[PDB]
Structures are given as C-alpha cells and as structure tokens.
C-alpha cells in the first residue's frame, strides 16, 4: 500500500532492522532476540514484573565413591513468579484452515 516506504539519499548503507515501537498511546517497546524461544510465540512482558526465584545455586557436589569410579552431582533448583497474570500479553497464530 502506498502509505509508507523507505528512502536512500545516496547512502551506501542498507539497514533492514527495527527494534523500537511506539503505539498511539505512547508506550514504547524495546525488542530483544532470544534463540531459546519457541517458533510460534511472542511475549509482551516487563523485566521487573518477572523474577527468577532460585532455591539453591548449582552447588558442585558429589554422590558417592566406588574407588576410581568418581561421580558428581548438581542441585540446581529455581522457580518462576509473575506479579499479575493479566499484565503480560501474548499472541499466537491459530485459526488455520
């Protein structure tokens, strides 16, 4: 649609990126790229609203000893909390076919 397009005034620089949005209400929105996400999902949240509740750090430790047959164990334990469920938005793709 003839409503928005790019312009290059003799610029030897192609930049096909956008990482900041401002909606009609004025709420800005930063963008971050994390490979550890599922393909069909995007998360609208806040850094402070979410926190990672940890129980015990890795805490390098051992299990037992049968002689030369050494072993090692880890005791990582964490938990996730959210301030308000109806405060971080998500939208998927559905209604196919």
């Amino acid at each position: 649609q003839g409503s928005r397009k790019r312009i290059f005034e003799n610029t030897k620089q192609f930049i096909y990126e956008v990482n900041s949005i401002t909606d009609p209400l004025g709420q800005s929105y930063k963008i971050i790229v994390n490979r550890w996400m599922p393909t069909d999902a995007v998360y609208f949240f806040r850094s402070a609203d979410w926190t990672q509740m940890v129980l015990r750090a890795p805490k390098r430790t051992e299990l037992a000893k049968d002689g030369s047959y050494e072993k090692w164990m880890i005791e990582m334990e964490v938990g996730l909390r959210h301030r308000n469920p109806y405060a971080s938005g998500v939208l998927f793709t559905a209604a196919g076919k």
């Binding site: 999902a41 990672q52 090692w72």
Partner: protein, 35 residues
C-alpha cells in the same frame, strides 16, 4: 595423563553451561504444572 589431563573441570563447566541453556529454553517455553 597422556593427551590433556584434568578433564573433570572441563566437563563440569560444559554441563553447567548446558543446564543454563536448558533452563533458559524451558523457562521461556510453555508447559503446565501437571502433577
């Protein structure tokens, strides 16, 4: 040791980073608390 020696700490750091990446991925992934 013949080749390198002191493989325990190498493997331990590898497993630490592995569990870090796993925690990140699973936490950013959705799964119910089925119990």
């Amino acid at each position: 040791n013949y080749g390198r020696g002191r493989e325990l700490m190498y493997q331990l750091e590898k497993k630490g980073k592995e569990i870090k990446r796993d925690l990140e991925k699973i936490l950013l992934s959705g799964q119910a608390r089925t119990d």
